[PDB]
Amino acid sequence: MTDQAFVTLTTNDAYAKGALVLGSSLKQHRTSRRLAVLTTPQVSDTMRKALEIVFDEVITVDILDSGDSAHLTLMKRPELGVTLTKLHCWSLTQYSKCVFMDADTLVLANIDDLFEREELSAAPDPGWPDCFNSGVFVYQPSVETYNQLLHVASEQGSFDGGDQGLLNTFFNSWATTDIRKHLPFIYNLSSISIYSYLPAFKAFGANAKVVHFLGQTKPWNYTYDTKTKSVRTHPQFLNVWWDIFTTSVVPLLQQ
Amino acid sequence: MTDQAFVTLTTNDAYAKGALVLGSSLKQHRTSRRLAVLTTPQVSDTMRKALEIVFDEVITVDILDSGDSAHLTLMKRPELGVTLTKLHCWSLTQYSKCVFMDADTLVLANIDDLFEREELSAAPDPGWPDCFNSGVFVYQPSVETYNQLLHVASEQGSFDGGDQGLLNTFFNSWATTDIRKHLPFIYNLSSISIYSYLPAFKAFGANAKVVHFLGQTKPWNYTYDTKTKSVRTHPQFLNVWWDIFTTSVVPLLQQ
Ligand SMILES: O=c1ccn([C@@H]2O[C@H](COP(=O)(O)OP(=O)(O)O[C@H]3O[C@H](CO)[C@@H](O)[C@H](O)[C@H]3O)[C@@H](O)[C@H]2O)c(=O)[nH]1
Ligand SMILES: O=c1ccn([C@@H]2O[C@H](COP(=O)(O)OP(=O)(O)O[C@H]3O[C@H](CO)[C@@H](O)[C@H](O)[C@H]3O)[C@@H](O)[C@H]2O)c(=O)[nH]1
Ligand SMILES: [Mn+2]
Ligand SMILES: [Mn+2]
16 A cells, blocks of 8 residues: 555654654554654754655654644644644555554564454543543544634644643544544553553453553653663553564664 | 432442432432332431432341341352342332332432433442443343342342442343443542543533442541531532531431
8 A cells, every 4th residue: 555654743853763663563563554653854864864764754743833834833832842743644645545543562473454344443542531532533634624623723632732622622522423433442552551441451462553652751751671672561662662663673783 | 210210229228318418419409200229227327318318218137137139149258248238229119110210329410310210220330441330230120130139249240349349240231232222421420530530520510410439448537627617629529518418317316
């Protein structure tokens, strides 16, 4: 497939590590779709070169530049910087359908069946289940949709200061319409849910397709012992992330 | 309506306080349906008399008695005591459709529109969103269904040691089938979600129809100052519970 793709995002080198591990995991599980990543000029050359290898397409977005359509909204609402860059995922009209995935997610199995879904499909967010988690979602690139989202961001902002509030407000039929737009929780398993509802994780966790390290601490914020091959019910996943980073990404950064 | 009813449960005097406040809140918001409560012999006479006043029907269930259909399963799986008593809600065949509600819930607005739903309708559980929270659900009394649930409880038990695991396993199409069986989160707003996703609560919390004090600490475990009329983003709801308990239930317990 050349007109469908997984799309991730990174505005710095820290999250680029996540994007590289994510991209590697998608290749590892033999995706037949394209891989694209939105980056900013703040991503260093070393990381960019690595990204050029793992991803089929590397797009550069600079909302700090007056030439960007989102620049004005950025001046007005500074807290939406990351959100505004993220919204450019809808500008990738070279693709007919895409699956946006946070840079802090990890794929455990082929998830190409997500392309069977329609915009806007996403998994329920723990905490407030009638809102979908914007870390993983199926959408359709469109300049019109992009302009509409940018307009809402400018006009009213986001109820949670991030893209999730904005997207839930725009795609507000999600909770009460079309069960097919509710992606199973295993396509965006928030690593925190392993504590909140451990019994559920024990019963269904083994079916996890995508792990999302939602929260303050990211995989790259841990120390990993290459000897014992473990970071210093959440480790199992963190160790998979590090096994991939250690085995595939680090050597790649060294060219 | 005489063949439809809200059904709650209490095995002791502590939860009877909750059942009385819940029942009062349903009357306060002018429900046109019947009110029923499952009780056990452990509920004292004082509480029972109060329950006989607030509820249209008080049913007594004693799984500790060999004559009860669930007794044997209780001997085999002791951790399911409360669950087995709860399952008797399906034995109330005098009603064609019911809304089960935990004794630790509180109604903030008329919710008779829930009777438009079909079994099994329930709200998403925070923590693991692909499981429904069993604190509030629409079901259809049936001896066959009761027997089927009892059989599963005996044969395999519950993945979480309580009724929620059992019910989710039995009604396992919930997460992927019929969006109408997904009751809006405001029909079972877990008081904890006020912390997890505060932004969401600020944006939609005002629409809460049912508050659920899910967790270790219940309303009756707090001290309430009748002078300042406040317990000693969660108080607002706890104070409503206590206003009702203080204003309507306490005087009732005094006859
Ligand atoms: O400096 C930054 C911060 C974020 N990102 C990108 O933005 C995504 C979202 O940010 P992240 O740090 O992963 O946020 P979360 O821990 O996943 O959480 C936030 O984002 C979730 C989904 O986007 C919501 O469910 C939460 O409420 C919100 O707090 C990341 O994966 C990256 O792709 C960057 O590129 N650079
Ligand atoms: O000694 C007891 C304990 C419970 N109950 C009844 O059982 C209901 C369920 O128990 P509760 O104490 O309210 O449990 P929760 O705090 O709501 O939580 C549990 O029950 C929820 C829904 O039933 C699940 O979402 C949770 O995972 C589970 O931990 C209560 O409302 C009562 O009606 C009694 O009558 N007597
Ligand atoms: Mn994330
Ligand atoms: Mn409860």
